[PDB]
């Protein structure tokens, strides 16, 4: 795989994609040879992500070629720009790639990061899902209970609401749950739902053209170890994708 | 599911 030659993309490897929905900095993937670290920041519809490739061996990686894979429909909604990476990674060395990100419109698919390189003549080919998700363009909005209910009532049309009941994956810990909601990009609104055990959030999704207001309600049932999540937003596909993402976090 | 939602959650937000 000298420049201009690639192998077919490897099937997706197991990675830490879901751990990066509500967090931005950490290790996305690691095997015996390579560590892929991420650091990112986002503001309104823009972001900047740094990818760190760490060679855990004493042997050089040669022809080291990272490619971001995005279908045409995703490219229409999510603009990624990057710069070349040196194809030689020394043993024990770490190399950095910058990805500049613009959300054009809401989107569901995730970019795939494919990495091909030579390790002592072996062919290495790794494909991992990159955690650029719709909620990265979510700006928290604090608001009063009265403002929330006015907006919630407007979004009463069924197309605006997506609801999901699911079994808890993690301990039903109030403090961890609040931190997940904040890490998702939502404000955490206290004393809106008259049930003190429930969680309410609000924010705005920023695209190149449009601000999409979003409201959320998360209801635990501690005994049954279940949750009910309700999204009401000003765009049907945003309600769907945010509910899909947040439903996997508790 | 509607009944599970009945028994485990609700009522509607105000």
Numbering used by the authors:
A (entry chain A): 689 to 938
B (entry chain B): 307 to 320
Copied sentences from the primary study:
Proper operation of the pivotal CME cargo adaptor AP2 requires membrane-localized Fer/Cip4 homology domain-only proteins (FCHO). The AP2 complex, composed of α, β2, μ2, and σ2 subunits, is pivotal to mammalian CCV formation, and its deletion is embryonically lethal in mice. FCHO1 and FCHO2 are similar in overall domain arrangement —folded N-terminal acidic phospholipid-binding homodimerization F-BAR domains and C-terminal folded μ-homology domains (μHD) separated by a ~300-residue, low-complexity intrinsically disordered protein linker, which has been suggested to participate in AP2 activation, although how it does so is undetermined. We dissect the network of interactions between the FCHO interdomain linker and AP2, which concentrates, orients, tethers, and partially destabilizes closed AP2 at the plasma membrane.
Since FCHO1 and FCHO2 have been suggested to bind the AP2 appendages, we investigated this possibility. No binding was observed between the different C blocks and the AP2 β2-appendage. Crystals of the α-appendage were grown in space group C2221 in the presence of a 10-fold molar excess of FCHO1 C peptide (residues 426 to 448, SEEQVSKNLFGPPLESAFDHEH), which diffracted to 1.4-Å resolution. Although the peptide bound to the top platform site of α-appendage in the same position as FXDXF and DP[FW] motifs, the orientation is opposite to that in these previously determined structures. The conserved hydrophobic interactions by the FCHO1 LFGPXL Phe436 and Leu440 (equivalent to FCHO2 residues 431 and 435) anchored the peptide to the α-appendage in the same positions as the phenylalanines of the FXDXF motif, facilitated, in part, by FCHO1 Pro438 being in a cis conformation: Mutations in FCHO1 FG to AA, LES to AAA, and PP to GG reduce binding to α-appendage to below detectable levels. H bonds between the LFGPXL motif’s main chain and α-appendage side chains further stabilize the interaction. (D) ITC showing ~50 μM KD binding of LFGPPL to α-appendage. Mutation of FG to SS, LES to AAA, and PP to SS all reduces binding to weaker than 500 μM KD. Thus, C blocks of all muniscin family members can bind to the α-appendage platform in a manner that is competitive with the binding of FxDxF and DP[FW] motifs of accessory CME proteins, and in addition, the partially overlapping WxxL sequence found only in FCHO2 can bind to the Cμ2 YxxΦ cargo–binding site and therefore potentially stabilize the unclosed but not-yet-open form of AP2.
